[PDB]
Amino acid sequence: APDPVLNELYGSERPAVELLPGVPLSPIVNSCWLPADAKAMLAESWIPPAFEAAAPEYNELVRRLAKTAPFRKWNELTIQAKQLEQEVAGLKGPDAEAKQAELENVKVQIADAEAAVAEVKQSFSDDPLSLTGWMQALTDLADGGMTTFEVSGQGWPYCSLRQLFGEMPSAAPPAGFFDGVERVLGTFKRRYEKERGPGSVQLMLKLAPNVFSDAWSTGGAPAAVAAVEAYVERARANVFGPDGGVTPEGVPEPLDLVQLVWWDFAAADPLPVLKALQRMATDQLQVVSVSEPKKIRGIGLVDFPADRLKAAIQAGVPITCVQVEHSVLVRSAQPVLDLCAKYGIKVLARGGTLGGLLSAKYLGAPPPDPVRGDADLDSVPGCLDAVNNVGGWARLQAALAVIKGIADKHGVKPETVALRWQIDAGCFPLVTTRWSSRVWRQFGYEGWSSFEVSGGRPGVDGPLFQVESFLDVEDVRALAGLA
Amino acid sequence: PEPLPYSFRVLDEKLPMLYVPNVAAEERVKFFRKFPK
Amino acid sequence: VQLEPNITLVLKHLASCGAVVSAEQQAALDHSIPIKRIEAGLRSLTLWGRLTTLNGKDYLVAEGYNVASSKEGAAVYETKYFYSQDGARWSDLQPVDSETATRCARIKGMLSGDPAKNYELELVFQIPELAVLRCRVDAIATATSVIPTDSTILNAASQVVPNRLFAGAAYPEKLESYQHRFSLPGSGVTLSQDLRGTWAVQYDAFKGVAQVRSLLFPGYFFYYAANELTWGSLYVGDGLRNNDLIFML
Amino acid sequence: VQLEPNITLVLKHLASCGAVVSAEQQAALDHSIPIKRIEAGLRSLTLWGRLTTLNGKDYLVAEGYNVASSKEGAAVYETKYFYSQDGARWSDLQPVDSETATRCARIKGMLSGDPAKNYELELVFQIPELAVLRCRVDAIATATSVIPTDSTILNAASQVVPNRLFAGAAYPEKLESYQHRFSLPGSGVTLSQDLRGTWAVQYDAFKGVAQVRSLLFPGYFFYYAANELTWGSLYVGDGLRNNDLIFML
């Protein structure tokens, strides 16, 4: 059976997949780059003639409310009430009494559903962070079909190197890089799961231990296991608030997935941290009776070379996914793809569009300049590094012209072609979300910010989420020739 | 007392592959002919 | 020949001209310029100068740029500036407006060391010190920025790149050998089409080293070593030009 | 892209390895290198190294070539060598005939100070100390003299000249990126074709400086900066050879 969300939205027959036995996985994964700091984002508030046609109450809430489960249940219950009223009026017999009992039951159900509807409508107005720009952006993204997320940000080398490889004071809390992103995504997750669905939105974290720190080096393996345990505890405190971190039965609800990113292999081997995370992912049975319940549902790895991934496999670590950089113009890690195909572990493809550089523009434009700055891309110096690794701006221009021709052959944006090429190689895409009137720009769509032009449709196109590829053999030959 | 043979580490720690670059360094390695190798 | 000016060469050849930096600051620059260079995407980032302050925490200013284009008949280098009180940490030097620069021009004397000060001008106006510093730095940069003539060259896509086949400036004891970076390589505009007495040149022929000192801004120095084919410029002092120049000549 | 290695950049990049010279000798070098370069009619003259003696008066040794041509598959440089106890005044190092060039390799121990010392070897043979020093310099130059690959090119009339369009060596960490000086540009001979464990390369990816140390001759260092294409080498320490390489590694 196909995914119902992708059935109605894109007429897609793609059946839903599962990253782990419990958690699902969207066809495309959203890497989440914050436009501003979390402090400047967690403080935003949506709360500002007798009728304001432009007031947010009549505009944003009427859309954000009809998407909640209580309202859908209310509408369905009203539908069944009207129907069963029609049949009970038609019948007029001994069965009509039982049917009238059913109508009374659905009446009290309607009553409680309407009470919940009023509750959620009030819950809209009594919290400031809801209905903001970024919260609405992620809500629209999740409603588009990409319910999986990935904490990421400006990273080595284009970021502050003192916030990565710097020695914090002893009094500092055990908070690492990619911290505020977890808080923002946790706020979004809790809000979305309160509005609709118990576990609708997934979240895949990222652990970046500073292996070059004095404490890590001088400590050893106990220091490593203590550090990873502390990170897991802090991440649990972030994704789930201080209340609600544990299920009512008393067993903690575990995280979805933790991604380990290692900075240097000749400095410290990742065996101790991998074993510690495996032990945190498994529950230690005693007799049978579960003891030390699982805190992490799975473990993934980031950018490990093929030999290191094989060495981690050979040590019993249950690796479930690996993300690598593999685009239509960069194919530097083929061995990892073959190794994952052999061992049957999912692979995630970061890149694809080279950071929005395969867009409609840049077709004949000069290279972007860091000091002057470009805003349609996510990271200008990263884009220039991608350009240099491709070979130069001329080769990128030729490749972009070829891709644009392929796109105009079918009628798609120049970026869906690259994303479908990534999907065809087996790997799952990894697209960076865009902010602040540039929403859906990562998929190529333009001028999609307002509801007047969008009409509620997602800023994606069907051919990208399709079981059969739209790339003909000539297109495949050309893209393979791009290299 | 008899040291536990190092091959039992595979069963006890449930680790699939073990590699001892130098049996001289290790002490749980067992020699069948009873002569140090 | 050289791709980027070398800081140690600049400090070694300008030692006589009085353009010097402290030992701690020298080592800190050595260790910290690459870090700030790679944090941004800048292909080039070098020390620009050292402005003197009143408390004793001199302002070290560095400038960088990625690519050098030619636009509206001139070489437009898109530059970014950073400042610091110690050689370790580099902070951004924000660009100022136009009227704010006009007001900048009316503050004289050395600015104090604290970047949180405010100057009062005249209806009253509040001028931050960082704005004054940026105003002075951009004024000096616009006025005097020397490179040897034809040491750069155009190319495909019309970007001003270094000229790897640079033969060396002939007759380098004269101002026709040097030019402002903004002047296009092909054009004949050089350091001789400006005022007749605002540049001094000393030359050692045996060692083959030329020193060009700006008299409009008495802190701007430049060296050109012909045997090694290496050039570099520095500024040391407060960002004040001596308007009473004529009586000095 | 450079044409001749600086004497200041070499001392700066090799200071950590202990390849340093006294400050007074450094100033004396700065003054008296061009004097000897003009007195000898040499287009290239650089400091080659510094050898330790039983006195504090070490031998500073500088080499310089006027012509460099391809000959029987060897890039022959017509080098001249000069020595000095202090940085001021230089003397010449006359080449050594083969008989004494073989009777000088058996004399070991670190040299004395006065270059008028006669070693006596086995009838007794009297050999001057300057001959021994010349032998040691020749041996180190034969074994070690290292430049980046493709940094030289062959023109008409079969002369090796610097490659003005040398864009730099990718993978500076790999020994393949470096070659001996007397290897022809066409031939694919590098330091990889030497013994496996006689060269140690430590490369700092961030600052873009690679450092190659000789283990067969422990006192030979060669730095190569890639962000700006600048390579230099220096030998500091006694000239003796490390015979027992197999045991140490």
Write the layout of secondary structure elements.
This is part of a larger assembly, with one copy of chain A (483 residues), one copy of chain B (37 residues) and two copies of chain C (249 residues).
Chain A: H1 4-10, E1 17-18, E2 24-25, E3 29-32, H2 38-42, H3 56-66, H4 69-91, H5 94-125, H6 133-144, E4 149-151, H7 162-165, H8 180-195, H9 214-219, H10 221-239, E5 258-261, H11 271-281, E6 284-285, E7 290-291, E8 299-302, H12 306-313, E9 319-325, H13 335-343, E10 346-350, H14 380-390, H15 393-410, H16 416-424, E11 428-432, H17 451-454, H18 473-482
Parallel strand pairs in A: 3-4, 3-11, 5-8, 8-9, 9-10, 10-11
Antiparallel strand pairs in A: 1-2, 6-7
Helix pairs in contact in A: 4-5, 10-11, 15-18
Chain B: H1 8-13
Chain C: H1 7-13, H2 23-39, E1 44-51, E2 59-70, E3 75-84, E4 91-92, H3 98-104, E5 118-121, E6 125-128, H4 129-143, E7 146-148, E8 152-153, E9 161-162, E10 178-180, E11 199-204, E12 209-214, E13 220-225, E14 230-235
EC number (chain A): 1.-.-.-
GO molecular function (chain A): oxidoreductase activity
Protein name (chain A): Flagellar radial spoke protein 5
Give short descriptive properties of this protein.
part of a larger assembly; 4 chains; B: 37 residues; mainly alpha; 1 helix; globular; C: 249 residues; alpha+beta; 4 helices; Flagellar radial spoke protein 2 (chain B); RSP9 (chains C, D); cytoskeleton (chains C, D)
Cα Rg of chain A: 25 Å
Task: Please give the largest β-sheet of chain A.
Answer: 7 strands, parallel
SSE order of chain A, one letter for each helix or strand: HEEEHHHHHEHHHHEHEEEHEHEHHHEHH
Strand arrangement, major sheet of chain A: 4-3-11-10-9-8-5
Secondary-structure-based class of chain A equals: alpha/beta
Shape of chain C: globular
Please give the radius of gyration of chain C in angstroms.
18 Å
What is the overall silhouette of chain A?
globular
Number of strands of chain A: 11
Strand content of chain C: 25-35%
Helix content of chain A: 40-55%
Number of helices of chain C: 4
Please indicate the percent range of residues of chain A in DSSP E strands (runs of 2 or more).
Answer: 5-15%
Kindly report how far apart the N and C termini of chain C lie. Answer: 36 Å
Beta strand count of chain C:
14
Helix fraction of chain C?
A: 10-25%
**Backbone structural class of chain C:** alpha+beta
What distance separates the N and C termini of chain A?
37 Å
Coiled coil (chain A): 72-124
Family (chain A): Belongs to the aldo/keto reductase family.
Organism (chain A): Chlamydomonas reinhardtii
Protein name (chain A): Flagellar radial spoke protein 5
